[PDB]
Short mmCIF file of C-alpha atoms and ligand atoms in Angstrom, two decimals:
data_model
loop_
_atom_site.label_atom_id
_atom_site.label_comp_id
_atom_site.label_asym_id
_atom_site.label_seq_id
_atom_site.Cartn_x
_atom_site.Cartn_y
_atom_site.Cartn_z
CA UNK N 14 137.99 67.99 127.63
CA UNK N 15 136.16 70.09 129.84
CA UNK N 16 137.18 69.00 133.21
CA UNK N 17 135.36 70.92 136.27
CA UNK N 18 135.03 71.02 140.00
CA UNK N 19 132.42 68.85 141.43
CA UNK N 20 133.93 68.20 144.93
CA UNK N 21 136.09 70.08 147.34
CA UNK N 22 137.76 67.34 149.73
CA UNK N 23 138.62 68.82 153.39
CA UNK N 24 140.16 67.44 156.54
CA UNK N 25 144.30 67.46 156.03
CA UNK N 26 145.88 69.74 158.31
CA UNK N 27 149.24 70.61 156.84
CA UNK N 28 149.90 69.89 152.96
CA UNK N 29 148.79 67.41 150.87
CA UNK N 30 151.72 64.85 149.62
CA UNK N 31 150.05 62.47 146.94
CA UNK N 32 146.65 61.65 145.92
CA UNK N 33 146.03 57.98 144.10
CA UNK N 34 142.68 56.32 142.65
CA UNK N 35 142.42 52.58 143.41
CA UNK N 36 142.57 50.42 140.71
CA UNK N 37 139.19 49.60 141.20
CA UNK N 38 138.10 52.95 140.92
CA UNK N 39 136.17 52.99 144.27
CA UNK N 40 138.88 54.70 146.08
CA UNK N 41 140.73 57.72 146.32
CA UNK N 42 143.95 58.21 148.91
CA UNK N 43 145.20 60.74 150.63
CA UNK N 44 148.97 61.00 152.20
CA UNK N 45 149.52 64.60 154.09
CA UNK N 46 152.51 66.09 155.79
CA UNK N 47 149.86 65.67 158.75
CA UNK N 48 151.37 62.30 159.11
CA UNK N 49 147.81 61.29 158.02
CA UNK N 50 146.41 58.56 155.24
CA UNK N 51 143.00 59.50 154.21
CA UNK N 52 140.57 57.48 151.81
CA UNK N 53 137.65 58.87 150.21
CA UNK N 54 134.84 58.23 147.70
CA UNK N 55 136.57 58.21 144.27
CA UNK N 56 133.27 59.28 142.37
CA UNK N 57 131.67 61.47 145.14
CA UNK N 58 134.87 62.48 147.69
CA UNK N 59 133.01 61.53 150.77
CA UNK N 60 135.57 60.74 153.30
CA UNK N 61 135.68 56.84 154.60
CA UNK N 62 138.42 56.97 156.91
CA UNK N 63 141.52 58.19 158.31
CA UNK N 64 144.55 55.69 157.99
CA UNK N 65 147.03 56.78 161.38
CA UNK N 66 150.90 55.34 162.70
CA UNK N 67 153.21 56.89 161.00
CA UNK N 68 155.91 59.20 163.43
CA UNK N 69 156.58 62.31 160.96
CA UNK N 70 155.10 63.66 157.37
CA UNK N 71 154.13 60.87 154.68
CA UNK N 72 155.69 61.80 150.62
CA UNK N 73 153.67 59.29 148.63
CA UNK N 74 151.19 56.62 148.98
CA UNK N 75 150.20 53.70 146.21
CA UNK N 76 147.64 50.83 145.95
CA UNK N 77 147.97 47.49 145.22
CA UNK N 78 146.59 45.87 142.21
CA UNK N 79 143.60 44.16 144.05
CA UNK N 80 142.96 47.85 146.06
CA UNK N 81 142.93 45.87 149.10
CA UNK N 82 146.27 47.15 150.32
CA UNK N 83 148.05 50.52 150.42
CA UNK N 84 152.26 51.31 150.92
CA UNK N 85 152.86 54.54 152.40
CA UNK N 86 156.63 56.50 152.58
CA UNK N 87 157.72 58.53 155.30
CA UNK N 88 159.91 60.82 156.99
CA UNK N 89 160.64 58.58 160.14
CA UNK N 90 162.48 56.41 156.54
CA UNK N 91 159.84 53.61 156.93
CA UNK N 92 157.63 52.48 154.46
CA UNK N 93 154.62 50.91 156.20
CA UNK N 94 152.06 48.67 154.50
CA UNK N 95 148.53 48.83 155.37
CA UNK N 96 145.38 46.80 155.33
CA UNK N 97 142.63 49.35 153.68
CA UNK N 98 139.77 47.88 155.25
CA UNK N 99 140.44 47.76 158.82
CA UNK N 100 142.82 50.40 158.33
CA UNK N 101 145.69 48.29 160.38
CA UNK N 102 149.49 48.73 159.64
CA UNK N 103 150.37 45.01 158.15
CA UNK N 104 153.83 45.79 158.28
CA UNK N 105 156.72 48.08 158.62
CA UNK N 106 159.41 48.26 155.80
CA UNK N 107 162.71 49.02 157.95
CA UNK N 108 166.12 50.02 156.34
CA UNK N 109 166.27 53.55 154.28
CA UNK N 110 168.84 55.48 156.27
CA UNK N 111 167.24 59.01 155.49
CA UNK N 112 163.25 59.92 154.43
CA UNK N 113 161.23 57.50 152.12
CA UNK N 114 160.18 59.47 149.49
CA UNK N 115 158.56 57.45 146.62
CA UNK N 116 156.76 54.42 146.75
CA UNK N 117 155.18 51.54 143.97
CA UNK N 118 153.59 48.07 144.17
CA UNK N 119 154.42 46.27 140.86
CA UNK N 120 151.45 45.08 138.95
CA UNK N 121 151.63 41.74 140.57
CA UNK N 122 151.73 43.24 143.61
CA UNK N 123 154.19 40.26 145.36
CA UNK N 124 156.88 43.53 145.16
CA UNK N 125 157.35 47.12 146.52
CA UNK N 126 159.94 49.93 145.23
CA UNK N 127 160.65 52.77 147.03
CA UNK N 128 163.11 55.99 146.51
CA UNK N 129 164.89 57.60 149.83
CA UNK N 130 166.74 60.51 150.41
CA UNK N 131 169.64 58.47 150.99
CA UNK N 132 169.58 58.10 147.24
CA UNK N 133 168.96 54.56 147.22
CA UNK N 134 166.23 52.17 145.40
CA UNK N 135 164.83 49.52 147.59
CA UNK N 136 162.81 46.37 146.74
CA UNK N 137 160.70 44.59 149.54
CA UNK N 138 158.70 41.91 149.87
CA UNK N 139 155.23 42.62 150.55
CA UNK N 140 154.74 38.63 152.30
CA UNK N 141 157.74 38.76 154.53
CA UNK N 142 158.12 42.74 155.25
CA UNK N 143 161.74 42.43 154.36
CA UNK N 144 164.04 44.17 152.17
CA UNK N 145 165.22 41.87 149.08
CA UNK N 146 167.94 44.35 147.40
CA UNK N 147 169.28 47.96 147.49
CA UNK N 148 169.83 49.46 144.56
CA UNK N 149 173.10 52.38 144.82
CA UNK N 150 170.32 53.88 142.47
CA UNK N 151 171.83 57.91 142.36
CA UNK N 152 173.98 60.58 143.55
CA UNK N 153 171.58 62.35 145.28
CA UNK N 154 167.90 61.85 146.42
CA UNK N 155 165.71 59.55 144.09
CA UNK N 156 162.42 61.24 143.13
CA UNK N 157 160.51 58.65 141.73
CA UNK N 158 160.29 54.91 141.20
CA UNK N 159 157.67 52.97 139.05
CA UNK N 160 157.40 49.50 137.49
CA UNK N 161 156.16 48.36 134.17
CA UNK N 162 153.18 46.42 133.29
CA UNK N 163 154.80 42.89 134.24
CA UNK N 164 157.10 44.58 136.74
CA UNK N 165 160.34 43.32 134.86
CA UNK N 166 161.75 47.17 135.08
CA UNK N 167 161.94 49.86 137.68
CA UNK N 168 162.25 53.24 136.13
CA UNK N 169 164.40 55.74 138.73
CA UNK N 170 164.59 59.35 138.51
CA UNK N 171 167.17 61.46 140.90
CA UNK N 172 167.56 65.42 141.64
CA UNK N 173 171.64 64.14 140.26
CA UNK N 174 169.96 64.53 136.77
CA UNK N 175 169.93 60.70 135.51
CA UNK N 176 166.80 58.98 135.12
CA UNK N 177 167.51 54.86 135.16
CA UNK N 178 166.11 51.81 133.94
CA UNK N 179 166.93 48.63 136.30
CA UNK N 180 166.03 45.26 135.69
CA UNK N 181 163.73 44.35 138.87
CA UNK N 182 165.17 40.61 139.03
CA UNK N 183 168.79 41.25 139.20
CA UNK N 184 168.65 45.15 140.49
CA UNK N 185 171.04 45.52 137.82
CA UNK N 186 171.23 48.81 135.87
CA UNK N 187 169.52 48.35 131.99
CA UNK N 188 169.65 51.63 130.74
CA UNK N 189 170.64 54.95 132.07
CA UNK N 190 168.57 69.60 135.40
CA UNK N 191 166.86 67.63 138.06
CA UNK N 192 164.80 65.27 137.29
CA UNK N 193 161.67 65.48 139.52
CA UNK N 194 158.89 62.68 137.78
CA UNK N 195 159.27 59.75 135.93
CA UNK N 196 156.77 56.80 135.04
CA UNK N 197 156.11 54.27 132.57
CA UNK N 198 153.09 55.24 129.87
CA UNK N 199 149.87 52.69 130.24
CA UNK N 200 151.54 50.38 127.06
CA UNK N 201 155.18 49.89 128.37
CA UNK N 202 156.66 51.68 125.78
CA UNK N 203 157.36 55.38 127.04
CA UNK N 204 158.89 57.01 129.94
CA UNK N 205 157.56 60.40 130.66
CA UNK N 206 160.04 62.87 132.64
CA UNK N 207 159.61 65.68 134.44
CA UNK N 208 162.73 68.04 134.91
CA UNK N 209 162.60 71.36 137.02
CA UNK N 210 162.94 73.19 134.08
CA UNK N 211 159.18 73.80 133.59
CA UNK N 212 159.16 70.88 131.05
CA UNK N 213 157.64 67.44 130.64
CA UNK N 214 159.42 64.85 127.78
CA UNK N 215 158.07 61.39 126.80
CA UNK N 216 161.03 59.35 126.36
CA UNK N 217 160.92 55.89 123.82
CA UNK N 218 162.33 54.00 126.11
CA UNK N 219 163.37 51.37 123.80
CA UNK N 220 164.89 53.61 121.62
CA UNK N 221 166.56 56.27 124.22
CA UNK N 222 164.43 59.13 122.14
CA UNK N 223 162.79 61.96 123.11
CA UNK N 224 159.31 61.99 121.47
CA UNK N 225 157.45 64.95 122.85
CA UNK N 226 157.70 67.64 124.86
CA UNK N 227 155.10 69.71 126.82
CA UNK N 228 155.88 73.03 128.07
CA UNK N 229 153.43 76.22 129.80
CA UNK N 230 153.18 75.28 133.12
CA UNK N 231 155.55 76.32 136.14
CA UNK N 232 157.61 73.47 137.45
CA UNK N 233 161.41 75.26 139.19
CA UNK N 234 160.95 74.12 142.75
CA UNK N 235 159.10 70.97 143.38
CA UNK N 236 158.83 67.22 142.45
CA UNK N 237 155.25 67.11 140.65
CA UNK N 238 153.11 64.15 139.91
CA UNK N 239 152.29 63.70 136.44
CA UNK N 240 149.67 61.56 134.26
CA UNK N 241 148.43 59.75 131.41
CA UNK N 242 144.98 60.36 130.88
CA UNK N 243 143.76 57.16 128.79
CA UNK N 244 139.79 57.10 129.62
CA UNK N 245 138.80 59.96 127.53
CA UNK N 246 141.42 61.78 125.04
CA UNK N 247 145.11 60.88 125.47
CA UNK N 248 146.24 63.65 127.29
CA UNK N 249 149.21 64.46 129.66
CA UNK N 250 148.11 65.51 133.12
CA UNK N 251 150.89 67.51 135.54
CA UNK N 252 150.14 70.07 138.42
CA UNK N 253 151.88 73.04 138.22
CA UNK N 254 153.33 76.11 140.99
CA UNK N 255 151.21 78.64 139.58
CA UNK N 256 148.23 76.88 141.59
CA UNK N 257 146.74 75.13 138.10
CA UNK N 258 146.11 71.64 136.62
CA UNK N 259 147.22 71.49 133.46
CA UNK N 260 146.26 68.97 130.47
CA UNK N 261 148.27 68.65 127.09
CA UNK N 262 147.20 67.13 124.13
CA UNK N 263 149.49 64.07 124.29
CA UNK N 264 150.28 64.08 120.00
CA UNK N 265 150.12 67.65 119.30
CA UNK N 266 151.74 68.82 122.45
CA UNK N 267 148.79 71.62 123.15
CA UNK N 268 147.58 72.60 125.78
CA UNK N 269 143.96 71.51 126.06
CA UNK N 270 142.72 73.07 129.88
CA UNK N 271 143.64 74.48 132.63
CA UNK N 272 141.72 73.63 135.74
CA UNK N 273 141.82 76.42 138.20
CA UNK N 274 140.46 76.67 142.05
CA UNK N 275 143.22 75.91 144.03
CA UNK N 276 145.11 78.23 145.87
CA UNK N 277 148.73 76.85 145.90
CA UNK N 278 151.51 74.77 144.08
CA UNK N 279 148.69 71.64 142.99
CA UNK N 280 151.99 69.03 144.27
CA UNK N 281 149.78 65.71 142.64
CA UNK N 282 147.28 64.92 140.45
CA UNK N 283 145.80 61.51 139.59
CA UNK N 284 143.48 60.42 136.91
CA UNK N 285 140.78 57.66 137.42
CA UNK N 286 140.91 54.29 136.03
CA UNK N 287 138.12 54.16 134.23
CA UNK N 288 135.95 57.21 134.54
CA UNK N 289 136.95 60.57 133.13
CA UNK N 290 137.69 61.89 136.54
CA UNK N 291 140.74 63.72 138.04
CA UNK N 292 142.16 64.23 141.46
CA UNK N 293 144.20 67.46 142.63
CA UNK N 294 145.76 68.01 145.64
CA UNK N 295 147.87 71.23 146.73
CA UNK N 296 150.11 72.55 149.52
CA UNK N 297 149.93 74.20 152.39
CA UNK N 298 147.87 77.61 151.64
CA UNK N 299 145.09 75.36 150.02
CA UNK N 300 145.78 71.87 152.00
CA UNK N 301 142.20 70.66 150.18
CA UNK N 302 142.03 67.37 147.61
CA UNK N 303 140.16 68.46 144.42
CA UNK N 304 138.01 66.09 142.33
CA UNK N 305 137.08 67.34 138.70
CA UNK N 306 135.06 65.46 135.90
CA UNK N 307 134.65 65.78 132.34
CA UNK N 308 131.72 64.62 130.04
CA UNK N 309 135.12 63.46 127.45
C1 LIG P 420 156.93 64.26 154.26
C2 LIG P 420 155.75 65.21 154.06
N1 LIG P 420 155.71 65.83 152.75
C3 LIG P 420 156.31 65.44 151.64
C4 LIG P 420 155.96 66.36 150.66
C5 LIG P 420 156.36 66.40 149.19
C6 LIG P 420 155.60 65.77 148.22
C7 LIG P 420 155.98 65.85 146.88
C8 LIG P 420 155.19 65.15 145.77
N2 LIG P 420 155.75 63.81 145.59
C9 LIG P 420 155.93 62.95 146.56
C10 LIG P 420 156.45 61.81 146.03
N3 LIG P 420 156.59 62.01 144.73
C11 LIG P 420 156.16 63.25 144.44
C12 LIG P 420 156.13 63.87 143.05
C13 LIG P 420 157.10 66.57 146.53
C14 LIG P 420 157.86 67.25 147.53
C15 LIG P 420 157.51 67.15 148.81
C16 LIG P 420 158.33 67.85 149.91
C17 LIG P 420 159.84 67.83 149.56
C18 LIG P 420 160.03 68.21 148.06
C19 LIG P 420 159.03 67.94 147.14
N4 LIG P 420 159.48 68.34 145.92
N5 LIG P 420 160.72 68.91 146.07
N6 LIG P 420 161.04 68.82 147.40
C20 LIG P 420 162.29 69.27 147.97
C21 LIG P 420 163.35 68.30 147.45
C22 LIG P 420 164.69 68.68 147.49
C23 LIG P 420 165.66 67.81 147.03
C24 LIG P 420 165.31 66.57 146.52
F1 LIG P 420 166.29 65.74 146.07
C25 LIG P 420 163.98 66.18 146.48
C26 LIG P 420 163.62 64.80 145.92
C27 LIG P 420 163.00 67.05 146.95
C28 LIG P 420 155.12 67.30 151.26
C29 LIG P 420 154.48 68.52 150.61
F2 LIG P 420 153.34 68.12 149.98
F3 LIG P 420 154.24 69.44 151.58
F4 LIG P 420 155.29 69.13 149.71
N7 LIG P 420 154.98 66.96 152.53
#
């Protein structure tokens, strides 16, 4: 690939938590430390709007499967669900004891997941606003949380080491270094895991085997997004604390590029639906949302 910088995307004012494209491609969000939601052209960055109510510093953001509705996760240990049109807070998600830190519609989008602090999973009702089960997911804070393609699983991931499969109908556990990422691959069939080891693994889930694993960039300290880029070449996409995107050959384990221009750890990165586009978003020295595009 030859991913580069078209546009620089300003206007956070403390670090930048998560970026995510909408499904439909129009959109890219924004969550901040600001306390601040921002949405912006996916293809050009221009800024739409500023999405405002939460008390302290938002983790993560994620869109629904229509893009017509975003779930945010906090540090006042809400979750709040908003309309992305009029920019109104639909509803509140009350009952993590400690900050949210993780958050995931499922594919139908009738469901929410989220990952706390106070190492529990939770799964909420996106109608009603209300909490259907907590899940006594880990030991210690829960780092990620993602559904499958039909929403039948929720894959955990915990700074106590364990990454878990639960089945999302009963909560029940399927399947059982930090471990700072996980997420399902775009077929179902693989898990890929971040650990704070400075390594990335995709896992066969079905078979409990590790398959690959991508190594080069710096990953000791922080809970890093990471991708599969499907639009172009199959590639693994991570940030990285030595201020770089970095892209992996998802077969051959190489590294492919390196995207460089931002000037801290890039926290999140984010790879467009459709379009061979990438969003990267960094902490506080940089505190700027980075759009890139390749011509493969
Ligand atoms: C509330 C405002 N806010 C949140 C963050 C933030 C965002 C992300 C990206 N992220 C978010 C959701 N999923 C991902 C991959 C990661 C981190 C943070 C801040 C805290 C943190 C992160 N990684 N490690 N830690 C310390 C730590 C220690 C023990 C633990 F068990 C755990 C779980 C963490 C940020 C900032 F962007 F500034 F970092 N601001």
């Amino acid at each position: 690939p030859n991913y580069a910088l078209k546009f620089t995307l300003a206007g956070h004012t403390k670090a930048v938590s998560s970026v995510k494209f909408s499904p439909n491609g129009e959109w890219l969000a924004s969550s901040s430390a600001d306390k601040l939601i921002k949405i912006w052209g996916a293809y050009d960055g221009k800024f739409e709007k500023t999405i405002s109510g939460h008390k302290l510093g938002i983790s993560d953001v994620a869109w629904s499967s229509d893009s017509n509705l975003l779930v945010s996760a906090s540090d006042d240990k809400t979750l709040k669900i908003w309309d992305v049109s009029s920019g109104k807070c639909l509803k509140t998600l009350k009952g993590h004891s400690n900050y949210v830190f993780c958050c995931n519609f499922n594919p139908q989008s009738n469901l929410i997941v989220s990952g706390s602090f106070d190492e529990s999973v939770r799964i909420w009702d996106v109608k009603t606003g209300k909490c259907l089960k907590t899940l006594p997911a880990h030991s210690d804070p829960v780092s990620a949380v993602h559904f499958n393609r039909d929403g039948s699983l929720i894959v955990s991931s915990s700074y106590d080491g364990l990454c878990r499969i639960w089945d999302t109908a009963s909560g029940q556990c399927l399947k059982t270094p930090p471990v700072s990422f996980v997420k399902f691959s775009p077929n179902g069939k693989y898990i890929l895991a971040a650990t704070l080891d400075n390594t990335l693994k995709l896992w066969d889930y079905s078979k409990g085997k590790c398959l690959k694993t991508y190594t080069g960039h710096k990953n000791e300290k922080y809970c890093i997004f990471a991708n599969f880029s499907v639009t172009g070449g199959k590639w693994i996409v991570s940030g990285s604390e030595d201020n770089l995107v970095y892209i992996w050959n998802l077969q051959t384990k190489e590294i492919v590029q390196k995207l460089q221009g931002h000037t801290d750890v890039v926290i999140s990165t984010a790879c467009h639906p459709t379009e061979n586009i990438i969003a990267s978003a960094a902490l506080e020295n940089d505190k700027t949302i980075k759009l890139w595009k390749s011509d493969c």
